[PDB]
Design a protein around this nucleic acid. Sequence first.
RNA 1: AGUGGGUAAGAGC
Lengths: 141, 49, 107, 61
Amino acid sequence: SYMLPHLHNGWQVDQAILSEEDRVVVIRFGHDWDPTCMKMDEVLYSIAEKVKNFAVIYLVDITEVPDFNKMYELYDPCTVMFFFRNKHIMIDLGTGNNNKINWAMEDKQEMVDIIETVYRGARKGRGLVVSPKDYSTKYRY
Amino acid sequence: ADAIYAALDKRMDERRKERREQREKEEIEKYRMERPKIQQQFSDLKRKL
Amino acid sequence: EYLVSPITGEKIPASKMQEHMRIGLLDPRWLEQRDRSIREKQSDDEVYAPGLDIESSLKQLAERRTDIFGVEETAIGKKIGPEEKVTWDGHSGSMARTQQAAQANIT
Amino acid sequence: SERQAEVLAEFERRKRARQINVSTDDSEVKACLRALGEPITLFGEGPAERRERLRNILSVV
RNA sequence: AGUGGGUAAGAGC
């Protein structure tokens, strides 16, 4: 959470999205004090260095930066957005909401797979990438 | 008009607002009696720092 | 003393002799590898924020998470214990309206 | 043309550079570089880089 | 009983 870089106004978010030409921008929209946001923060920080080559991590507090809440439906406790060359990328996670990752994922390997699949799909010019692992079921048994 | 509606809602929510907030405060104090805040458990070491 | 380098054939003193050998056969591709190592080291980008940002982020979290910090225990996300920003809805039809609202937002 | 001539000239210049003896003593290298009229250290270069610079300077002259 | 978990992405007109 506190380790990852933080963006304070919407213009900084725009500059961060624009300035990345060959890396996928992963932005966590939420509140640093939210436990689900805390899980996203800890997972991202765990894999913030492994995927440095083909990704970058930014943290945005939607209370101090509400400028996207209307347009990006930033109302879930924690959402994850992927961008490539100033273009939001959708992921067919299987949950019915391809626009964002609105839930907390425990496994960092799953998030690394998601980021790599997003990079592969968006590099090829595609706008929607099929997630390697289905998420229509939590597989709890 | 939004201010008037909000004042209306606050006035109506004030039926037991003070009672239940006092109850919540008492329950919070009872819970913290045996389980202090995390920064409280480190306050002494923090001062020694 | 004076010794002849077996790889160079020059009269060199014995005091530096062993050292003269060590940096005598040094492979220039080692210099190349060191150069590429320092270039890739300078090619890194700060993945994590500096100390000021981390300290400020912890202060902000503490101001909100009173169940972990502070003295007064409020709810999970409350700090205690005019102008409202207008945001685009992502519709091209309202682009002009948002633009003129931002223009009116000027000082 | 001039392109082949210049690239060949640099080719044999490098070949000459590979076949020139330079002392491993840092002090003697510093004295030689000072005698040649060039600064000893180039923006905080390493001793190996200093030796390479001296070798190239000797090759050119 | 029941909603969903069933948006292909792209090009400018």
